[PDB]
Symmetry: C5
């Protein structure tokens, strides 16, 4: 039983993030618990302040006509309990609920460990025989406590796109709003545990330049390459199957190379030292002690810049 | 209280994918949230446009007779909320819901990392004392936003099989429809992280051809073989127990061999170099430096072609 | 309000497997979705065909008296929706529901990778002041689509034990039926990934017979034993704590030995080659090159036969 | 509307285990499905046998006053369906339900792989204005089929503590009962898979006593120590964070030591064999070939006895 | 229908922990099952003791007006069943429920294995046209059995913040309370399994100071470094992505270094022993046998103190 308007009835929206959590990078989802504030002139139940009762009359959802506000990008039926329904005299209804639903916002891992994200909550609403436009009321949209959590992410700002997008979806215009959660990752735990340790092995790898023992130069370059995989695997796991290239997926791959050519070298510092030509061998090995680290620091300044600087 | 027809009452269906996600390869399932659009002539509640009310009359599900449309291949009771029920004058009912259920579609890992899939949604409907045929209305079946997600898969097309299949299931014909979601995997993250790294170790493995040290030739071929298993395990994990052979399950197995005979060789470059016959040894070892890589690139072109080319 | 019989009211049962899946070996459970067909003479609501209405009258569950059919071996309250209730003239009721419940059938891993299983569904029913016998109607018991899934198992036959077992449970006879799902495992993925690779290492292990280097004979027999554990671990994991012996638990254990005595040998090919008695050492080592593989192929023919052949 | 007694109304309880399963060692819980039998004199609905109806009158739960019997140690609301309610003439009510709830009983891993447990089910009941004492009726308490499962545990006996404990909990005495499930673990799968394999490596470890190669003595003692961890990890995983010491946690830790001092020795059989004093070295190494295995079998008889013998 | 007060109606709260469990460090949540006790003067249903019925009148929730007490930091709708509602004469209502909900309290891993935590439960309550203040009644707040579990944590005290915090949230003051659960971890299983074993390898690592074999000095320092990662990985897994530094994340990282410079040394005890200057080499190697262990015990006393002592 919808409110007999004379034009498209506006519905005023607003989300108050109460909790944020379980941002699942693999899954590309996160869970939010928050307030949903709605309002509208249903002149149909205006009510003679003085003439009866009091300032504002409290209804149960069965009584009033209420607008169906479905969240767009959610796994399941949004799981909300109702808090208060308070109809003003002029027929103005005041609705508040407290949902908890896991949202399906996408993320851009193009800078992986050093990436900033922009999450989305949605809210369409289909029309019947009056048109429905939704729109935000910014006093119930300052939704974000001073407690918003979201483990391992710094949260930058909860804001929203004022102008809705109105579709025509199956011979009935709907109206969709865009609630925006900006977050930067707390890269860091990534250095002491991945970036650094992954670098350290790479160096030890090429300790085997100042060495002439093939036995201990493979027991060297090779023993480390193994352990690199154990990082490539560690990382490739807590991350999804991107169709593009990660930053750390780059430097983690660019690494693979400086092990191959490391191995190349020790390998040939030998079919060139057993070929009685240690003239050369100890010339090459002497060289790699510079070639490698430089082209690395060079290729990192090349790579690094290729991702952030552009 | 079903609609007194004069023949098999047609029910018009239609799914609008709103969300796609959590495609579980191990499980052979995926979760979808989407619109379900139904319609039918229940001439029984036709209604004198002019004579009363308005263009179309809105009912609650309790009032009207509504067709039971169960999804066939679903783990649990499909989890749907109703959106709108709008009966036209001629007795034509307009139904719309927004379900979220995890579907059990099978997948063919015969090309694993480079595989395209065709997912299914179903919708039977049992007859009572009128027969029920279901069928698709293609304006509520363009179901797929420009946001359909499905992480790590490119989505090719959401379409459907117009002609239903009508069974006789327990002395009551049912009618089943076939909704088709075509997807190709975003192979790629598979290279920098599996294909390539898995190749690199194989090479270093057989660096130990240009070597005469047994100590460092096993510390070589063997140290890498280990690391191969650590890939075979990595891969065998995020994949199910196929009764057939995978592509990467092939090349990952074909790999096992070039390590065995690598080991064979270094092993015999020794009971043949200690047997004072380095004549031969340094003949064999010299050979494997070609035999191996070739028979590999050969067996890959043989294998690769055996899977894609046929 | 139960049907006033003159003797034990028979209830006619019948299950139509619609879906099978998530057979959990560790858990010893599996999930099934399927039809449950019941029937009984409640002469109490017979109904004058001609005199009123039609052929058969449709009731809702609240109206009729319906027999409580609880599934015996289930984790939780069986999760079923009702499909149709159709009372015949003579007072014969026709009931059909579509449950989805996870069953707790035990399995016998005595042949692990090569094992056939017999799963169970149950259905007791307690008596009140008439006795209740249950029994199967085999036209609603041909329950098994041509789609029954059950990943990684071949399904042999869904059948049922006609003669129920009638208990006396707490001063009230109940009646239990036995629905049987026979399945064989798709052993196979077990070879290319476990059986074979697990064998291959065992062989390389004892390459160190044709070797005199202790350094590379331990770097040999030992480096493989490690990798065996990595299989014993892989397998012991996707399997439960049996109080008896598995097949593969056998050959996986029998394996442990041929590494110990392998190690024994290389170990003594040395305190016997450094003791200037290479007379003996190169006699023993020469021997093991036969002793081992034979006693293995022998102990496998012994073991294998001890499990399947008996 | 509770029964107007003249003293504390006794309620007669009784549990019939139908199923047992998913005993979760990490979680310290297990799931049970079983019958719950209750009874009491509600003289208030006594009923003139001859004067009307029959022997016993069947009620629905809404009609009668029924005692709230909550299970004490359960994760969630016990999940039960009702089976039969049968009021005797003298006002004696006969109640039966069939719940399935996961119980939170603690376990004592002090003898881990060889441990016997005693599980608990509870049943309090709060008083109102008559006091409620609960108590067991041992004919509905022989609850345990000849099918009770509980994978990987032998089940010894389902019994119960006749005398309830009556509390005063918040100005209202409650009454709690103690249902006891005694189980012994099927240790065994623990030997062929853990105990034994974990021993075998320890031996090979100290094959490196009959060796003089440091290269192959570390490639020895060390290669095995790794593999021990892989057991310590395997075990530490399918087990909780005990504040006390396990048996196998002991012997698994006592093991760590015989590797350290093994390493200590090989290590010093060298800074003592390169120090031209092979006099000593080959005296120590000669010794450890007895010292170790003995002090182990000794420290095991010491340890083993310290756990079971006391 | 809320109670016509003359000022802000106080609601008296109180939680009785019945169960605690599944504290998820990664997730930063834990599950609790407990009593929730509420009360308030609804003078509106005062009731003439003598004049009718008895001492106190029992209602069902539909009858009375009951305050909506939502838990603040919870994943989902708190899952509670009602136990008793008992209105006193003066209009004083007595409410009791038994909820089971998983709470989202944060944790501070800054001392990881040796850390004490303070968990939170919340309970807001929104006002309508009377204001609502909540507040604790400490006789239903002694909530904690002598059975509170919480595996692997010692539980210190369940207490609560008497003075609520009253917000203005969306033109309606709410009132929030703070229930505090203090727990210390049972560090320990962390030693025999992590701390110790992680140390032991580090030592063996630098056995390779009393060695001159490069072959067995890399087969030494390197073989252990690998095994360290296998701890860094073990630990990094059962812990979340902190934006700060852990204790064990420190010492686990500080460890990485003493392997690098260990490797540095053995590496240079060689390009300095092959450079015919064993003068120096056996001077350095001689040194590291003190430098290392000291700077470690020093850097641990430095580190350890940097975390606990400050
Ligand atoms: Sb190794």
């Amino acid at each position: 039983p919808p409110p007999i308007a004379d034009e498209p009835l506006t519905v005023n929206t607003g989300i108050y993030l109460i909790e944020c959590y379980s941002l699942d990078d693999k899954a590309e989802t996160f869970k939010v618990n928050a307030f949903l504030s709605l309002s509208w002139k249903d002149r149909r139940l205006a009510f003679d302040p003085v003439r009866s009762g009091v300032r504002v009359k409290t209804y149960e959802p069965e009584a009033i006509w209420i607008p169906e506000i479905r969240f767009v990008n959610v796994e399941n039926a949004r799981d909300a309990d109702v808090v208060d329904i308070s109809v003003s005299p002029d027929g103005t209804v005041q609705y508040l609920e407290r949902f908890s639903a896991r949202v399906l916002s996408p993320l851009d891992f193009r800078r992986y460990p050093f990436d900033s994200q922009t999450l989305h909550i949605y809210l369409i609403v289909r029309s019947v025989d009056t048109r429905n436009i939704v729109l935000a009321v910014d006093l119930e949209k300052v939704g974000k406590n001073d407690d918003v959590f979201l483990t391992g992410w710094d949260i930058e700002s909860f804001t929203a796109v004022v102008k809705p997008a109105n579709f025509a979806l199956e011979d009935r215009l709907e109206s969709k709003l865009d609630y925006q959660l900006r977050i930067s990752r707390q890269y860091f735990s990534y250095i002491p545990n991945i970036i650094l340790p992954m670098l350290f092995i790479l160096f030890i790898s090429w300790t085997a330049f100042w060495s002439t023992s093939y036995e201990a130069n493979v027991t060297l370059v090779v023993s480390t390459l193994i352990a690199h995989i154990a990082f490539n695997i560690l990382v490739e796991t807590n991350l999804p199957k991107t169709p593009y290239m990660t930053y750390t997926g780059a430097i983690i791959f660019m690494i693979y190379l400086f092990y191959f050519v490391a191995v190349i070298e020790v390998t040939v510092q030998h079919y060139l030292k057993v070929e009685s030509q240690p003239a050369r061998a100890a010339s090459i090995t002497r060289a790699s002690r510079i070639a490698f680290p430089v082209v690395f620091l060079l290729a990192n300044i090349i790579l690094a810049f290729l991702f952030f600087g552009f």
